Design a binder for these strands. Structure first.
Lengths: 80, 73, 87, 76, 73, 89, 82, 74, 160
RNA sequence: UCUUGUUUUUGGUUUUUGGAAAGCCUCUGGGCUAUGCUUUCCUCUUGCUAUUGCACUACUGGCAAGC
């Protein structure tokens, strides 16, 4: 499915996302999954409060993701 | 010596049993049948809410999603 | 294969028993709004087609009732079924 | 290394006392020894005890839990 | 289905997990699952107070997990 | 693309861009606006038009136009905008 | 061997749908899927705590559907047969 | 099936989510889980707006779908 | 070149630079048949046309920005809020509004926050700015200048 | 031939807001119910002034006050 391949293609770029938690995470993406796991670095979190933090490495569960936000050049990518 | 969930519910059938839900409520009553999903069935059941009887209903089935507990009275 | 086996013996048999007996049923829902009616047909997920339904639900305490002719209920919303006979 | 179901298999043989936490309820916990289990992570506890933040130790008996509600399984 | 996740690089290293109910745990990563069930040793709570209680070997459920971090690079 | 400087940097970024779009729409379609509040880039903006004649007209007619209190200074940009380069080739 | 198959017959009639979200939706049904995903035509949907707003082509993520309140003219006995 | 869903492709859509938020933009890619990909997206939390860009939503998060405008020639 | 359904259907449609859905309608004389846009746009660009009156709109709940540059607007319709409830930005640069009283219908647009009337004869009328501020208090930015408190008070004296 | 058992479609429920403690105001019914206000806990608007810089953006001056 294409909604997963687009994700894999944004590996390397910087990504924003939203979780069921309520907070949004921003950082370079290293690995993804068909599950929608993620592996990121130099993350800059921002919760409901506005509280910023730093997280060196992170793993996620897709189930916990609401939605992603992806770079702009990833709209000319091929959809097979 | 191991006691597994199917064998446990295959031996629990008939006797008095109390089972909770995810929302606090706990119902007592004897057990008639058990599906492969657990998915309980009860007869002559009295609903104990916060350790207090509310309404005697009788014949019952509970969807297997809400079941938190299974044990005995 | 094994689905045929459980409909006769298991928990779900008492609806098949009741619905064939032309029986009424009390259903406790996940919406906190109980359903009182007579059933037409059911399924393995507890997807039930109800007829002549009447709800009972508190407010801010005020109880309110409404009659509905035909109603397909998705089994997810159901949490507890009470299969009460007239006899 | 140690996989997760092989770790739980050790808790059956040793008959070790294990406290179980719930999914969306920190106020409640459980206790007891492990007789058996299955593929879907349902558990048959023996001499299980209901504990709280108040430390209100309430007894139950031999019970069974659904695998959907667990979070932590911890030795002693 | 059942994509066995990429947790090989975290094995036998310290972690800072987060779980449902805003509760979090430190531990050495022993083993992982298809569904992301985890085995942690030298498990220490991080209470809302900040009071850190030592527990030991622990099996965290997969569903619960929100995320998994690394303390030291 | 025209380069604007001497802009009141107290306006929030999204409001600045929306007023810029509004003001400059009178001369032709504005394709995009690049404006940042970094130390380096604050008080500036790049306004990109589909048509070149539109950019020239904008430049001559709005030179020193009072915008949010200050007279804006407009000039042709040094380089071609990335969006223009992609739209051309 | 599913009650879902009966809903594929249902097409064309109007229904007031309730969801887990707590909304209410009057509109004609066009198509119904095996995964419950229904598409509607000429719709008047109202959100929990807002005014009713008319939409042309509504479609719903089946997961969210609590119940269909069917019209009173529809014969059940005929539809329950394969 | 999914015959209807291909028909929506490349239309500006109004998507309500479980949170209440409503995303808007064209539809580029679609899934069996109802994962939607959307181009040039805006949320409307409610007298509010935000610009995101390319957004990939899950199936869990989505509630309803509704066409804003016809398919663009651009 | 009537503004027709057919005209609207072949019109450039895109996401603009401020991230809104905009329809490009840049010699229309009369605003009509907007029904066919189906309320799918956040912005509508009517610049460089020959429209005389800002009127004739269907109920359009989406429409938040109206760019109406270089037309011949000499009058504003009276029921505008009833067809455009969330109208937040109105750009009327280089049109034909001549009397302060002709700007009166804008008082009924409750969400109107960005208003531009430059290059209109009305601009040179004595007290034009204060008149707009008192009669259309919902405006926060007028002619790309911040409506300030002191102007509001001054407009409260005159016209009180 | 199957498709309700942890990452989507047969639900773990719900999102300035919610809950708790007395007082005041308004509405309804014959001292009850609902709402707001008042106390505690968990970027925006005023002034002022800094920066004149050729870009592709989580965000973007600093100081004081208000929320």
């Amino acid at each position: 499915s294409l909604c997963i391949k687009l994700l894999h293609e944004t590996q390397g770029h910087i990504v924003t996302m939203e979780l069921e938690n309520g907070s949004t995470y921003r950082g370079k993406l290293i690995e993804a999954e068909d599950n929608m796991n993620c592996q990121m670095r130099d993350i800059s979190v921002t919760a409901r409060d506005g509280r910023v933090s730093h997280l060196d490495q992170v793993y996620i569960r897709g189930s916990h993701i609401r939605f992603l936000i992806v770079p702009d050049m990833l709209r000319n990518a091929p959809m097979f | 010596v191991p006691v597994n969930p199917k064998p446990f519910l295959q031996g629990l059938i008939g006797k008095p049993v109390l089972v909770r839900l995810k929302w606090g409520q706990e119902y007592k009553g004897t057990l008639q049948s058990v599906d492969s999903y657990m998915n309980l069935q009860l007869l002559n059941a009295e609903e104990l809410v916060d350790g207090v009887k509310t309404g005697d209903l009788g014949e019952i089935l509970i969807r297997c999603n809400n079941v938190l507990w299974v044990g005995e009275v | 294969r094994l689905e045929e086996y459980e409909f006769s013996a298991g928990p779900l048999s008492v609806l098949q028993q009741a619905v064939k007996n032309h029986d009424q049923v009390l259903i406790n829902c996940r919406n906190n709004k109980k359903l009182l009616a007579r059933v037409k047909a059911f399924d393995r997920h507890s997807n039930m087609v109800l007829e002549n339904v009447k709800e009972m639900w508190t407010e801010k305490a005020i109880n309110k009732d409404r009659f509905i002719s035909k109603m397909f209920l998705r089994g997810d919303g159901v949490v507890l079924v009470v299969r009460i006979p007239s006899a | 290394m140690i996989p997760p179901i092989n770790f739980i298999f050790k808790l059956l043989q040793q008959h070790t006392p294990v406290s179980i936490w719930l999914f969306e309820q920190t106020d409640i916990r459980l206790q007891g020894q492990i007789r058996g289990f299955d593929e879907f992570m349902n558990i048959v506890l023996d001499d299980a005890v209901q504990v709280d933040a108040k430390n209100n130790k309430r007894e139950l008996g031999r019970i069974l839990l659904k695998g959907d509600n667990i979070t932590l399984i911890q030795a002693i | 289905k059942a994509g066995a996740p990429d947790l090989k690089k975290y094995l036998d290293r310290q972690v800072f997990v987060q779980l449902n109910g805003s509760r979090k745990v430190y531990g050495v990563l022993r083993g992982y699952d298809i569904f992301l069930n985890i085995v942690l040793e030298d498990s220490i709570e991080e209470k809302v107070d900040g009071e850190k209680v030592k527990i030991g070997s622990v099996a965290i459920r997969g569903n619960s997990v929100i995320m998994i971090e690394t303390l030291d690079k | 693309t025209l380069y604007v400087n001497n802009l009141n940097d107290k306006i929030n970024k999204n409001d600045l861009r929306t007023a810029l779009y509004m003001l400059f729409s009178t001369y032709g379609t504005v394709v995009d606006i690049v404006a940042l509040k970094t130390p380096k880039m604050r008080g500036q903006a790049h306004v990109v038009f589909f048509d070149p004649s539109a950019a020239a007209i904008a430049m001559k007619a709005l030179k020193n136009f009072i915008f949010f209190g200050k007279e804006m200074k407009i000039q042709y940009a040094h380089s071609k905008s990335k969006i223009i380069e992609r739209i051309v080739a | 061997m599913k009650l879902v198959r009966f809903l594929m017959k249902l097409t064309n009639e109007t229904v007031s749908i309730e969801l887990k979200n707590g909304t209410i939706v009057h509109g004609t049904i066009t198509s119904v899927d095996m995964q419950m995903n229904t598409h509607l035509k000429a719709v008047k949907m109202t959100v929990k705590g807002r005014e009713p707003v008319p939409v042309e082509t509504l479609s719903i993520r089946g997961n969210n559907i609590r119940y269909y309140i069917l019209p009173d003219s529809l014969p059940l006995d005929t539809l329950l047969i394969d | 099936g999914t015959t209807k869903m291909v028909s929506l492709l490349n239309h500006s859509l109004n998507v309500t989510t479980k949170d209440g938020r409503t995303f808007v933009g064209q539809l580029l890619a679609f899934d069996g889980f109802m994962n939607l990909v959307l181009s040039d997206c805006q949320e409307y939390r409610h007298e509010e707006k935000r610009m995101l860009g390319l957004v990939i939503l899950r199936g869990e998060f989505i509630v309803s779908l509704s066409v804003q405008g016809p398919p663009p020639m651009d | 070149m009537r503004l027709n359904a057919e005209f609207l259907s072949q019109v450039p449609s895109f996401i603009s630079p401020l991230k809104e859905t905009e329809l490009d309608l840049r010699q229309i004389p009369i605003i009509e048949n907007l029904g066919v846009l189906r309320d799918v746009h956040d912005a509508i660009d009517f610049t460089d046309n020959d429209i005389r009156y800002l009127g004739n709109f269907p109920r359009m709940k989406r429409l938040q920005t109206l760019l109406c540059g270089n037309n011949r607007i000499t009058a504003i319709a009276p029921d505008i809020g009833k067809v455009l409830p969330n109208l937040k930005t109105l750009s009327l640069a280089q049109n034909h509004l001549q009397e302060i009283a002709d700007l009166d219908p804008l008082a009924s647009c409750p969400q109107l926050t960005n208003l531009s009337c430059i290059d209109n004869p009305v601009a040179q009328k004595q007290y034009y700015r204060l008149y707009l501020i008192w009669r259309i208090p919902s405006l926060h930015i007028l002619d790309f200048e911040r409506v300030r408190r002191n102007e509001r008070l001054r407009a409260e004296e005159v016209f009180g």
